[PDB]
Ligand binder design. Structure first.
Ligand SMILES: Nc1ncnc2c1ncn2[C@@H]1O[C@H](COP(=O)(O)OP(=O)(O)OP(O)(O)=S)[C@@H](O)[C@H]1O
Ligand SMILES: Nc1ncnc2c1ncn2[C@@H]1O[C@H](COP(=O)(O)OP(=O)(O)OP(O)(O)=S)[C@@H](O)[C@H]1O
Ligand SMILES: Nc1ncnc2c1ncn2[C@@H]1O[C@H](COP(=O)(O)OP(=O)(O)O)[C@@H](O)[C@H]1O
Ligand SMILES: [Mg+2]
Ligand SMILES: [Mg+2]
Ligand SMILES: [Mg+2]
Ligand SMILES: [Zn+2]
Ligand SMILES: [Zn+2]
Lengths: 84, 97, 637, 364, 699, 66
């Protein structure tokens, strides 16, 4: 479960950066470390909760993104790298 | 050793010195440090380790880290008439390391 | 009826008939209760119905029954209790509560710790030593409720039991509180005819002296019943003998479904408040008749003050007047409580200032070791709330409670302060009230109360220059406020003056002191350290029963007998001497280390009274006044 | 590693290393329990040989009385005993100990801005009370599951411990061993008759340090210590020797302290102002989850029966000054707080190092 | 059945009830019987509480024993089971209740008119049912037996208002006095004061007395005993009793008409028709003389209900007699073992060790003691030297301490400004002059005294603190020592070693008699009319004549000017005075009593009642004594001008010095019990001001 | 436990079993012992029923009393 905010460079002036919550499945776990700008493709759907929210008084749901793909927008040297 | 107020879970934070093991720790504004951080730096350069006795946890953590520190001289300027120890609030043992 | 129950009852009958000490202990309890009842009938205290049983005598009598009590106490303790009750009722016919049992002796592998207690010791009789950390409020528990039916005018009752009051688990039958009889009439609760038994919960933690130095401590819960409540306070070191028992079902029912496990606690049978060094339990020693005759034989000698003083710390050379002052402090004077409520001190306070490495800390540690209720503090280590009192918050009631500092815990005892000159100013102001008014008045946010801090203060301090200078006046040497010096009855300046013959005496005394072996020890074998815990009831090495020098264990008994027995009173022959010396000291032209205020006068009285406790005399004579006067003069001049 | 534990390791044996945060108190689990019906009085025994379950009762009391299904009596005396009719007879039941441990990845290898992750572990029988918090352990165990009542089907993982290996063993009084084998006894006796024993023990003290032979002799004497005496009057004479080394910077006094810390069976190297998060002398703090006074730590107390190497001995707090004084002569630390009063052992030799003022030493 | 088995007890509640009725009718202490005059005053709505004396019951049993008739031990039965005997007495009192002589009116209480309407309504039910049953004429036929049977069927078929809903009185138990027990060879557990430790589970249900300090008093709140409901469907009033901390309200009507009918009415709460008790919860703590060695004091809960509310205040030494009763368990459910119960003391009687000055009344018995002390003469010197009889000397110090205890006249002007009448006294002196003993004596004599060490109380420990009361569930302000000493004396020992916060608080207290708090919790002012007695040392701890008196009295000029009298208590050595001091101290130590047998020192209770009667006075000043005071003030200011440059200055003369002279003169006139201030009072006031500073320093 | 208590009975089955064993091997009414011959016949599959005679046991008890 990974919390994603809007990148602070792209936010309009008076507005706070919105955040959503992204669920990473079996192969996508531990891919994106926090603090880096990433781009997620996924299904935008509603998280179901019991008795909705009593504080709001309105039938309001929360939203999640089930990640389909993760793309990042390394100190590994190959056989050519050591020769170089 | 810090307990999260919400998770109620005790976690052991080694600090920036233990976290920089086999690496480099970069301490900006080395002069206006506080006392506990000075003691942590002194131990991390003497023994290359940090010993903790907190919350039932008594252990030592390896802190083999290089340190690149930045400091401002006393009064905002270096005075070449005075030697180094009088321009910096750092004491002699930490300056010698 | 059970056959094995009756067999064990008969076996305990044989054990009680073999050893008559338990029989006449039962006799002594019953006659005490009977004479108290008869005194209440004609013109008070009631001893509990329980008997201390030695496990060693039982092991000598019957190995099987001893192992049965230790390993399976639920099957063996109730037959023994029924046997004791039958024995008590056998002799009570001529002159109702069932008799309980308590255990002393060697427990072997069952002498455990809150850390050492594991689940292999469950359903076993364990003796656990530790420190009391939490003590719940003593709460009455309803056993039998009595009710009245006004329509039919009859009294009913209902008995109530729980799993705690029994060692053997029975079927839990919850009988509800009857508000209506079988015929439908309303019942009125008859308080005063119902029976309530005091119940307490204490938490026993491992002692900080025997705990690992960095790990979190382990604790256990102990349940106490009516005769065993209020035998402990938090901070005591204790030994609790009881059955380690598990209760309920550890989540194995449907309703419980959690992993608290099975709840484990100790059904307390015996509580022994142990005396430990610098703790709140006072050391008490049983005075036999032979020891009383020995004490009275010492008291008749003319040289009595100089044997008990010189027998304090024979491994410290010199400092004889300090030994006299420490002995008089241990005696402690007589406290006067006037009819209008005003209060006069009895305690003697000693301050020692002087050169480093002059047996000051060793004398303080000696007073910590040999006094009944000495508590050790240092200068910077404890603070104003550390010595006096502090406020904390209760978890159950939610209201603030008090935590007692060094002065309150050492009430009717000695506070041994090291590095007295390194106190903070607020701590010094806290000390000012304790050393004179003998009380601690705390007025916190919502809490305003006065605690009794009747203490004798012995303190060690250093001069501000690190060394005492003869030419410089003592006002800058000690450099302490005159109120504090007036609080201290005797101020001793110890100087490390260098003399050849004196240094030779020092060297010979120390080198003969470093050549000692305890009896039963080999030449090269290192001495083993055993932690000193004593049960609280209620340079010559060869000192054995007053040859020339008094042993420390007999010095303790002499001090205890003198403090408990004799309360001397002044007479005119001592008063004349005290008045004349106080008038001379007030108007003398000689410079003195301490200022002479009115306190010094009462100091003389206390010192004289202290010497009268040394001689075991109900009267304070002229010789007591003179020895008080010339002990004061040496400290002043 | 702890971060590579995936769903492919579930209900499998995994070997994994880390450091221990906390060891819980010993809970009492039931191995053999005798039960009896409330009114039917049917006696039964449940034996349990599986204790790996957490947050759930894998073996519980029977929901109904077992007298009807067994048909044990030919007489067979509609009667129902009721739901959950069994009561545990505790004085005929057998129990074992169980412990919750908490394991973190080592803080040396953690992502810079991230929380170090941790797992709970359960151990039983002779696996309990084998490790103290703070030790570094590799542990073999079953990676298993419990449901805690954030996702429709999300389970909390845990480790059922099958074995614990301690990589390094801490030095303390309770962890010290006094048992000797006959070969080590023979080797030490053969060593003691060497006429150049003093020379070889002085040469073995810091062979990489040039000079300072008298200092090395002093260090050997400090390591041995003197005979302690307990006298009939109760006051004790100490045997530990406290040596101060003060001098110019760059004279290998800190290396001598480090070597003494390495060679001593019990030792701690601290500064005059303590450590980064370990105090000097003795600290008494409130307990985390029960708010009770206990000895938090401290160099002079953890190194009981050993050596405390105090570097930069001249810079020190006033608390530590008086506590160090009382620990150097009396070998005891007296704590008198608002709730706790004790005198605790500090039988420790002190080897201190100091650098004088104005840089180098002045002969004037 | 055997499921609720029965036991035989020696107590019988029929013959004891008959004994109760006979005691109520026939007791005469020696108009008519005592408890028929008391119930007559209750019925006339002139008395709200009935206090039953166990001394009276013991005396009653005594003349029954002297007459030879057999009487049960009612006193022991009360002392064991007082809770039942409360309603036994209430039933007996309601059995023989006198009719009210005075008719009800519009100046009468609402509860009283409700009770009158209930009694009249019950009478109307009885009369109407009698008329209906008689008009039915079932048998058409012994007139007296017919009337008796008709009365019995009417009283069993009607539903009346119960007696409990018709009491206008609260019934309490006064414990038997120890002296009356000594006369008549009775030994009672109720009379002896216990501590909280001594009150165990074997005293539950018994009438017992506890001695201690009150630490906490809750606000008076209405605790409902029975709830009244109205039903619009049937017109009945349904009452449900409450004997617990919580209750469930009733929804459907439980009256007979609604119980029989298919349609059920709805009950609505009627707070005027329901019964409430004034309820307070107090905390009592055992005195330091009762705490054993090395122990922390514990607390006990006192429940005050009915008339006895507001008779307990924090900081009171009190003997509270009440019924020791159990309550349902409060705490964690995991820690209980069986039927654990909390405990409380349902208060019946309150005895104050120190009687409040505002509670003083000029009763008959007080007058002969006061007149005896007046006719003994020299009451100023007699009360002065008897303040601390075992402290030698310091006659003028004790005189100004007596004036501190009495105080002057509080003055109000129609413009709204107030001048305080309290006197503030400072004792600054060398160590060992027994000024702490004087502070202890003064605020042990005073009924509302507080002893305070300078660093023992912090800033929050003197002014105020905001904290939650759970019984009334509201966030309340609790004051410090300056609130506990309101209308009393605050003893501030070690005055010179204090912080600036307490100095500023006391600085505002000694002039405006209020503390203003403007913090993150509260914005308020709180009354503190304390008279302040401070004890202090000089700058170096000892007075040295080299520097000026102002120099070694390290004390700011404003706070110095706030003190009316400051005593330099110098410890000057001499051959003669030290002899007499040593003789005094040694006599006190040997004989546990004062040396001088030429005077009888006055008992603290006697001094307290005399000081209260003196404080009732409000003396005034005539033109001649005003002129003398003005001339003295003028000469004092010129002297302070003249001595300002010199080293002998004690400060600079102040209008506060004028007001202090006026207040000391008014206190001295109060001690003489006069409505006028005389010339000799001002003479003594100026002499006291002069001897406070100049006389001992010049010598 | 108390749900199944115990009583003491005069019968003791161990010494009675020993007496039965001794009676089987030492009873001789007047080839060898009687019941040993019967058990030899049983073991040889010539006898199927063993009849324990109580007059024999009474005689055995009486001769042990003598
Ligand atoms: N005489 C010597 N023989 C061998 N190595 C030495 C010698 N003197 C210094 N060194 C080395 O040089 C370094 C000196 O560090 P230390 O002298 O131990 O620091 P220190 O100056 O003693 O402590 P300070 O005063 O707090 S900087 C170490 O790495 C030593 O191994
Ligand atoms: N005039 C006196 N008469 C009788 N006893 C006195 C007198 N002066 C002093 N004392 C005794 O000496 C002691 C004085 O104690 P304190 O009341 O503390 O004096 P103090 O003036 O308050 O000292 P401080 O705290 O340094 S200002 C007590 O034991 C008194 O009984
Ligand atoms: N008069 C003496 N007789 C014997 N030993 C002494 C004497 N004075 C000092 N010592 C020794 O000197 C050591 C220093 O301890 P101590 O003198 O108590 O320190 P301090 O004087 O600083 O409190 C002790 O171990 C003690 O044995
Ligand atoms: Mg010392
Ligand atoms: Mg160094
Ligand atoms: Mg004082
Ligand atoms: Zn059943
Ligand atoms: Zn209705």
């Amino acid at each position: 479960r990974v919390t994603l905010q809007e990148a602070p460079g792209t936010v309009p002036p008076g507005r706070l950066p919105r955040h959503r919550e992204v669920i990473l499945l079996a192969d996508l776990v531990d891919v994106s470390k926090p603090g880096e700008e990433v781009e997620v493709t996924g299904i935008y759907k509603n998280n179901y909760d019991g008795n909705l929210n009593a504080k709001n008084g309105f039938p309001v749901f929360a939203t999640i993104i089930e990640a389909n793909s993760i793309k990042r927008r390394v100190f590994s040297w190959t056989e050519e790298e050591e020769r170089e | 050793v810090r307990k999260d107020p919400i998770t109620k879970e005790w976690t052991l934070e080694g600090g920036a010195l233990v976290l920089a093991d086999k690496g480099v720790c970069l301490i900006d504004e080395f002069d206006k440090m506080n006392d506990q951080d000075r003691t942590s730096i002194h131990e991390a350069m003497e023994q290359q380790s940090i010993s903790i006795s907190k919350a039932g946890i008594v252990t030592t953590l390896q802190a083999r880290c290089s340190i690149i520190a930045a400091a401002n001289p006393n009064g905002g300027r270096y005075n070449s008439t005075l030697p180094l120890a009088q321009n910096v609030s750092l004491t002699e043992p930490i300056l010698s390391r | 009826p059970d056959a094995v129950f009756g067999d064990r009852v008969r076996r305990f009958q044989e054990f009680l008939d073999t050893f008559t000490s338990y029989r006449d202990s039962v006799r002594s309890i019953q006659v005490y209760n009977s004479n108290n009842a008869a005194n209440y009938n004609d013109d008070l205290n009631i001893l509990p119905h329980r008997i201390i049983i030695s496990l060693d005598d039982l092991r000598e009598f019957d190995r099987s029954f001893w192992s049965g009590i230790l390993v399976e106490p639920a099957y063996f303790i109730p037959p023994a209790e029924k046997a004791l009750t039958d024995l008590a009722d056998s002799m009570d016919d001529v002159p109702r509560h069932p008799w309980k049992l308590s255990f002393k002796g060697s427990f072997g592998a069952h002498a455990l710790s809150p850390r050492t207690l594991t689940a292999q010791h469950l359903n076993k009789l364990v003796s656990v030593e530790g420190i009391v950390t939490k003590t719940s409020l003593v709460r009455p528990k309803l056993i039998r409720s009595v009710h009245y039916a006004a329509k039919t005018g009859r009294f009913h009752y209902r008995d109530y039991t729980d799993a705690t009051t029994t060692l053997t688990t029975r079927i839990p039958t919850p009988a509800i509180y009857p508000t209506e009889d079988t015929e439908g009439n309303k019942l009125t609760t008859e308080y005063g005819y119902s029976t309530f038994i005091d119940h307490q919960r204490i938490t026993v933690q491992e002692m900080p002296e025997m705990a690992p130095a960095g790990q979190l401590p382990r604790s256990i819960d102990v349940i106490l019943d009516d005769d065993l409540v209020d035998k402990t306070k938090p901070g005591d070191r204790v030994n609790v003998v009881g059955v380690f028992k598990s209760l309920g079902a550890g989540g194995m029912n449907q309703s419980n479904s959690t992993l608290i496990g099975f709840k484990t606690l100790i059904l307390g049978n015996t509580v022994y408040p142990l005396h430990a060094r610098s703790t709140g339990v006072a050391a008490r020693q049983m005075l036999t008749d032979f020891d009383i005759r020995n004490i009275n034989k010492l008291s008749k000698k003319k040289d009595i003050f100089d044997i008990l003083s010189q027998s304090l710390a024979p491994s410290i050379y010199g400092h004889d007047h300090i030994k006299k002052a420490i002995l008089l402090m241990l005696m402690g004077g007589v406290e006067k409580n006037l009819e209008n409520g005003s209060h006069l001190r009895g305690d003697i306070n000693i301050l020692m200032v002087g050169d480093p490495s002059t047996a000051k800390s060793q004398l303080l540690r000696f007073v910590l070791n040999t006094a009944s209720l000495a508590i050790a503090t240092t200068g910077r280590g404890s603070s104003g709330v550390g010595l006096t009192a502090a406020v904390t918050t209760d978890r159950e009631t939610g209201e603030r409670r008090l935590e007692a500092g060094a002065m309150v815990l050492a009430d009717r005892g000695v506070v041994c302060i090291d590095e007295f000159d390194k106190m903070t100013d607020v701590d010094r102001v806290a000390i000012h009230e304790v050393m004179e008014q003998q009380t601690v008045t705390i007025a916190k946010a919502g809490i305003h109360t006065t605690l009794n801090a009747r203490c004798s203060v012995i303190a060690a301090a250093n001069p501000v220059f690190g060394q005492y200078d003869v030419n410089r006046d003592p006002h800058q040497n000690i450099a302490l406020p005159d109120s504090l010096l007036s609080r201290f009855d005797l101020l001793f300046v110890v100087t490390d003056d260098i003399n050849e013959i004196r240094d030779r005496s020092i060297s010979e005394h120390v080198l003969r002191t470093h050549r000692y072996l305890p009896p039963g020890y080999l030449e090269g074998e290192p001495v083993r350290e055993r932690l000193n815990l004593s049960l609280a009831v209620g340079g010559n090495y060869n000192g054995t029963e007053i040859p020339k020098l008094v042993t420390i264990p007999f010095l303790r008994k002499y001090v205890q007998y003198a403090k408990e027995r004799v309360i001397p009173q002044l007479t005119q022959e001592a008063i004349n001497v005290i008045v004349k010396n106080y008038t001379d000291l007030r108007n003398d032209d000689n410079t003195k280390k301490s200022p002479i205020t009115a306190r010094t006068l009462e100091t003389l009285i206390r010192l004289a009274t202290a010497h009268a406790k040394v001689r075991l005399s109900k009267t304070v004579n002229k010789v007591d006044a003179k020895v008080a006067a010339n002990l004061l003069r040496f400290a002043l001049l | 590693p702890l971060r590579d534990l995936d769903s492919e390791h579930v209900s499998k044996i995994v070997r994994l290393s880390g450091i221990i945060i906390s060891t819980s108190v010993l809970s009492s689990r039931a191995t053999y329990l005798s039960i009896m019906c409330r009114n039917c009085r049917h006696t039964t025994s449940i034996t349990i040989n599986n204790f790996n379950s957490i947050t759930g009762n894998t073996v519980s009391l029977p929901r109904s009385c077992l007298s009807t299904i067994e048909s044990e009596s030919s007489m067979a005396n509609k009667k129902n005993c009721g739901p959950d009719p069994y009561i545990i007879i505790h004085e005929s039941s057998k129990f074992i100990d169980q412990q919750f441990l908490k394991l973190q990845e080592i803080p040396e290898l953690v992502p810079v801005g991230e929380m170090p992750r941790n797992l709970t572990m359960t151990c039983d029988r002779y696996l309990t009370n084998k490790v103290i918090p703070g030790t570094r352990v590799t542990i073999v165990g079953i990676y298993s599951i419990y449901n805690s009542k954030s996702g429709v089907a999300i389970r909390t993982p845990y480790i059922k411990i099958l074995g614990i290996q301690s990589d390094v063993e801490t030095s303390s009084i309770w962890n010290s061993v006094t048992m000797f084998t006959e070969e080590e006894e023979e080797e030490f006796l053969q060593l003691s008759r060497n006429p150049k024993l003093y020379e070889i023990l002085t040469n073995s003290i810091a062979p990489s340090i040039f000079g300072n032979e008298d200092i090395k002799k002093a260090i050997v004497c400090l390591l041995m210590g003197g005979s302690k005496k307990i006298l009939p009057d109760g006051m004790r004479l100490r045997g530990d020797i406290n040596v101060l080394l003060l001098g110019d910077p760059g004279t290998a006094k800190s290396q001598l302290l480090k070597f003494v810390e390495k060679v001593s069976p019990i030792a701690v190297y601290t500064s005059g102002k303590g450590s980064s998060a370990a105090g000097l002398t003795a600290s008494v703090q409130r307990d985390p989850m029960t708010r009770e006074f206990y000895l938090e730590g401290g160099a002079m107390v953890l190194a009981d029966g050993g050596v405390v190497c105090i570097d930069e001995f001249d810079k020190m707090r006033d608390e530590d000054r008086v506590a160090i004084h009382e620990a150097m002569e009396q070998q005891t630390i007296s704590i008198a707080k608002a709730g706790i009063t004790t005198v605790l052992n500090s039988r420790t030799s002190v080897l201190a190092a100091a650098n004088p003022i104005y840089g180098r030493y002045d002969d004037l | 059945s055997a499921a609720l088995p029965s036991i035989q007890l020696p107590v019988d509640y029929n013959n004891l009830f008959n004994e109760i009725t006979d005691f109520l009718v026939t007791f005469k202490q020696d108009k008519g019987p005592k408890y028929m005059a008391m119930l007559q005053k209750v019925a006339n709505r002139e008395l709200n509480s009935v206090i039953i004396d166990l001394d009276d019951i013991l005396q009653y049993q005594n003349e029954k024993f002297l007459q030879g008739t057999q009487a049960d031990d009612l006193v022991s039965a009360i002392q064991q089971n007082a809770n039942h005997f409360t309603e036994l007495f209430c039933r007996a009192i309601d059995n023989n209740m006198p009719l009210p002589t005075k008719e009800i009116d519009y100046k009468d209480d609402v509860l009283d008119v409700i009770l009158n309407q209930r009694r009249l309504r019950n009478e109307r039910m009885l009369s109407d049912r009698t008329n209906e049953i008689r008009s039915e004429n079932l048998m058409d036929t012994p007139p007296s037996s017919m009337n008796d049977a008709l009365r019995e069927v009417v009283e069993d078929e009607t539903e009346l208002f119960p007696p409990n809903l018709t009491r206008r009185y609260f019934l309490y138990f006064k414990p038997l006095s120890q002296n009356c027990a000594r006369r008549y060879r009775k030994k009672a557990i109720s009379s002896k004061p216990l501590s909280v430790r001594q009150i165990k589970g074997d005293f539950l249900g018994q009438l017992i007395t506890v001695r201690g300090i009150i630490t906490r008093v809750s606000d008076v709140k209405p605790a409902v005993e029975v709830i009244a409901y109205t039903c619009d469907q049937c017109g009945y009033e349904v009452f449900q009793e409450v004997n617990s901390r919580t209750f469930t309200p009733l929804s459907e009507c439980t009256s007979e008409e609604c119980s029989q009918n298919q349609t059920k009415g709805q009950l609505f709460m009627s707070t005027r028709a329901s019964k409430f008790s004034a309820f307070q919860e107090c905390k009592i703590q055992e005195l330091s003389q009762q705490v054993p060695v090395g122990h922390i004091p514990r607390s006990l809960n006192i429940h005050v209900n009915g008339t006895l509310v507001r008779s307990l205040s924090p900081g009171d030494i009190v003997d509270v007699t009440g019924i020791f009763l159990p309550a349902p368990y409060t705490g964690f459910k995991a820690l209980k073992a069986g039927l654990l119960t909390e405990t409380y003391l349902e208060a019946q009687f309150v005895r104050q060790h120190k009687k409040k000055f505002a509670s003083f009344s000029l009763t008959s018995d007080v007058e002969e003691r006061v007149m005896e002390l007046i006719t003994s003469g020299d009451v100023y010197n007699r009360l002065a030297k008897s303040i601390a009889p075992e402290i030698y000397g310091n006659l003028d110090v004790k005189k100004a301490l007596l004036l501190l205890l009495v105080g002057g006249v509080d003055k109000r002007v129609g413009d709204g400004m107030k001048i305080r009448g309290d006197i503030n006294v400072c004792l600054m002196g060398d160590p060992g002059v027994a000024k702490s003993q004087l502070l202890k004596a003064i605020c042990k004599i005073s009924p509302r005294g507080v002893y305070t060490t300078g660093k023992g109380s912090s800033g929050v420990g003197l002014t105020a603190a905001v904290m939650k009361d759970p019984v009334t569930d509201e966030m309340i302000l609790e004051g410090g020592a300056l609130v506990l000493a309101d209308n009393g004396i605050c003893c501030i020992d070690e005055f010179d070693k204090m912080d600036e916060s307490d100095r500023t608080a006391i600085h505002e207290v000694m002039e405006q008699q209020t503390i203003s708090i403007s913090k993150a919790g509260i914005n308020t002012t709180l009354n503190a009319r304390t008279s302040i007695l401070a004890a202090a040392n000089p700058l170096y701890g000892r007075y040295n004549p080299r520097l000026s008196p102002l120099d070694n009295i390290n004390l700011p000029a404003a706070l110095l000017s706030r003190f009316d009298i400051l005593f330099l208590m110098l410890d000057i050595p001499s051959r003669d005075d030290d002899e007499k001091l040593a003789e005094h101290v040694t006599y006190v130590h040997m004989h546990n009593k004062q040396p001088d047998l030429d005077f009888t020192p006055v008992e603290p209770s006697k001094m307290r009642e005399y000081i209260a009667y003196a404080k009732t006075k409000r003396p005034v000043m005539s033109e001649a004594v005003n002129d003398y005071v003005v001339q003295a003030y003028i000469r004092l200011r010129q002297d302070s001008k003249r001595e300002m440059d010199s080293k002998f200055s004690f400060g600079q003369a102040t209008p506060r010095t004028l007001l202090g002279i006026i207040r000391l003169s008014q206190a001295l006139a109060k001690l003489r019990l006069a409505d006028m201030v005389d010339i000799d009072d001002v003479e003594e006031a100026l002499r006291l001001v002069r001897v406070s500073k100049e006389s001992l320093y010049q010598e």
